[PDB]
């Protein structure tokens, strides 16, 4: 594994080499958004080693060479199912967190467009619907992630939560975050206000802002939610989706936008869809256009060997014949170097 655990200093020489993430960093940075299987692996091994891969290295280099004066650049982690797109986004997130950016991290947009039972028409705007449970759940993890930067932000308007309760210009954004977290009915409006304030303050220069959205295609893919009349609800009618589209719009600077495509959890998209237009539809492609796609593919031989060595070091591959080169080749064939399939295979060996 790498002796260089710094997210910013590790470079091409560390390709296919591991990279540790301390439990304190995990608690402070990833209350959400880690793949469930990787979370389970972390809990099992008491470690959070991520392999330094070429896509993550390239995206890190782009972010380092960015110029905050220009409007926020949109990068799109892209590729096949279970190739490490989400973990590459997590790597970039950890890098920026250690670089002291405000990380507006959406762990999975797909969760916001299905299964919601608390869906209600938004009081602030009857045209749109609110998702109080999801809003509060995201807000809690967002506060946990970026509490230190939260106090510094000065809100620029007066936001009324009722005819009697409001938050005033010059107040910390922590006030709005706490209001949304506590008063569940106002969580969606709090999330919208937070997105607005972060987007504008990044341009003002108050702080560097990294928007990091997984499953970005959900912002334009059809939703499975229904009205009271059993009628389908378009994605924009959700307040969270509307505000996140506004955030994705590149009409701001002082930050960068990184989105990761994900067929998993997507609605009305075939399994073998991994191209950007195919996953995003034409609407989403034009919305995110222009953007820089970053491909993530199956492990190269060195990455495969490094991952196998990590598993052997942890003794995860308890199978007697797993260490043998025959077992190594069997795993390589069965997973075809796909990290997700290889992890699932090694899960029961």
């Amino acid at each position: 594994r790498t002796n260089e655990n710094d997210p910013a200093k590790h470079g091409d020489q560390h390709e296919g080499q591991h990279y540790n993430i301390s439990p304190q960093d995990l608690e402070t940075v990833f209350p959400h958004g880690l793949p469930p299987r990787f979370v389970m692996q972390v809990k099992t091994f008491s470690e959070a080693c991520l392999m330094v891969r070429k896509p993550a290295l390239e995206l890190l280099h782009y972010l380092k060479n960015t110029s905050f004066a220009y409007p926020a650049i949109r990068y799109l982690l892209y590729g096949e199912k279970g190739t490490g797109k989400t973990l590459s986004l997590c790597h970039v997130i950890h890098f920026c967190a250690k670089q002291d950016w405000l990380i507006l991290h959406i762990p999975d947009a797909h969760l916001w467009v299905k299964n919601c039972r608390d869906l209600l028409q938004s009081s602030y705007n009857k045209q749109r619907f609110d998702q109080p449970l999801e809003a509060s759940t995201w807000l809690k993890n967002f506060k946990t992630t970026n509490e230190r930067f939260l106090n510094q932000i000065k809100v620029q308007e007066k936001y009324v939560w009722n005819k009697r309760e409001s938050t005033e210009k010059g107040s910390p954004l922590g006030e709005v975050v706490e209001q949304g977290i506590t008063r569940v009915r106002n969580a969606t409006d709090a999330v919208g206000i937070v997105l607005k304030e972060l987007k504008r303050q990044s341009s003002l220069g108050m702080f560097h802002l990294l928007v990091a959205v997984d499953g970005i295609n959900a912002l334009w893919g059809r939703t499975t939610l229904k009205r009271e009349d059993k009628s389908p609800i378009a994605p924009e009618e959700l307040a969270l989706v509307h505000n996140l589209r506004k955030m994705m719009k590149n009409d701001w600077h002082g930050g960068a936008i990184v989105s990761a495509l994900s067929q998993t959890g997507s609605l009305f998209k075939p399994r073998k869809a991994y191209l950007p237009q195919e996953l995003l539809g034409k609407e989403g492609f034009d919305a995110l256009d222009p953007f820089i796609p970053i491909l993530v593919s199956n492990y190269n031989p060195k990455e495969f060997e490094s991952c196998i060595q990590y598993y052997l070091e942890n003794n995860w591959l308890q199978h007697e014949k797993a260490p043998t080169e025959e077992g190594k080749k069997e795993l390589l064939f069965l997973s075809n170097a796909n990290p997700s399939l290889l992890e699932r295979h090694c899960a029961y060996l």
């Binding site: 073998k272 080749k329 069997e330 390589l332 064939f333 069965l334 997973s335 075809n336 295979h345």
Partner: protein, 192 residues
């Protein structure tokens, strides 16, 4: 030994199985008696005379070597082109195997021949399959790939593959439903 029918044809006489057995036992005794050439040629009047085939290697546009084969399983039919060199990459209908066969069982079925002959990663393959389900297609592709690989592996390896069953077309197919019964063999619940 000529069957009783052949003996009857030769003797223009009807015979019983017991008579034929007696005659055959006498002939066996004659042969075992360490007889001469005249007796052996006389016995020849009554004596009656009773491996996998390898496809030919071909060369592509670049001249690189390959072999072609076909196989069938259930309703599935597949045709496989196995090249002499590669990184174990198998493209089914132009789709990589890991994406065409999400089922680890079918991926194992694809793996089986190369693993048997110790050639994991030593060849690339392009296969086209149709009909049948996922498992039928996997079996058909396995059979086609094994038959093609016979073009490269040694004869000992080919015989070992046959003995392992990689080169036998599985005759097991669906059995027609018969009238008056639920399925191929499931009779209706006997009423009382």
């Amino acid at each position: 030994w000529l069957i009783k029918e052949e003996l009857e044809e030769m003797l223009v006489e009807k015979l019983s199985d017991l008579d034929y057995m007696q005659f055959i036992r006498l002939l066996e005794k004659l042969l075992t008696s360490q007889c001469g050439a005249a007796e052996e040629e006389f016995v020849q009047r009554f004596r009656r005379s009773v491996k996998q085939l390898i496809e030919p290697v071909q060369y592509d546009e670049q001249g690189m070597a390959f072999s072609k084969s076909e196989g069938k399983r259930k309703t599935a039919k597949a045709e496989a082109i196995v090249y002499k060199h590669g990184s174990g990459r198998i493209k089914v209908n132009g789709i990589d195997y890991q994406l065409y066969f999400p089922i680890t069982q079918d991926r194992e079925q694809l793996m089986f021949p190369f693993h048997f002959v110790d050639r994991l990663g030593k060849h690339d393959v392009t296969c086209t399959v149709s009909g049948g389900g996922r498992s039928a297609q996997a079996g058909a592709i396995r059979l086609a790939m094994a038959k093609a690989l016979c073009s490269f592996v040694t004869e000992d390896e080919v015989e070992w593959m046959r003995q392992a069953g990689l080169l036998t077309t599985d005759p097991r197919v669906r059995e027609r439903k018969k009238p008056g019964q639920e399925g191929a063999r499931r009779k209706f619940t006997w009423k009382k």
